[PDB]
Amino acid sequence: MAEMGSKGVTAGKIASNVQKKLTRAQEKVLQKLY
Structure with missing residues (x-):
């Protein structure tokens, strides 16, 4: 329920x-x- 884990920051960093x-x-x- 909380979007703080961030599991795509790198996948989109690119x-x-x-x-x-x-x-x-x-x-x-x-x-x-x-």
Whole structure:
């Protein structure tokens, strides 16, 4: 009932890692698109 154990932080850590790469690119596009 408590979601504090965290058994997927690492399984998604990898994703948060790839998503961080999207931000750097997101900053570039944000300047050309808008």
